[PDB]
Amino acid sequence: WADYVLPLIVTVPIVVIILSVTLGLTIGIPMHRNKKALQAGFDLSNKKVDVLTKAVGSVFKEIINRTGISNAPKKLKQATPTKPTPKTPPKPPVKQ
């Protein structure tokens, strides 16, 4: 043995680098996907609630119209987050 000290100084950092990069990619790639899934899931939750709000609002509107109770609660309109899912501005096409 014992001839190998100078290549060990080359080889050890290279393996560490490869293993570190792989670890980075293996953790990094799913973290980006999780974020996107989480966002999509919340976006969908918000949409579903919005649909629910519209349905519940429609039923009330019809009940009110049919019972003569002329004052639909102004609050159902407010539950509809009219917040526009911030459309992450499409990353400008990096013109290569």
Binding site: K48, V51, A55, E62, R66
Partner: peptide, 11 residues
């Protein structure tokens, strides 16, 4: 949502 829709339809 479906349940609420069903009640609407019934009303």
């Amino acid at each position: 949502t479906t349940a609420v829709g069903s009640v609407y339809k019934k009303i």
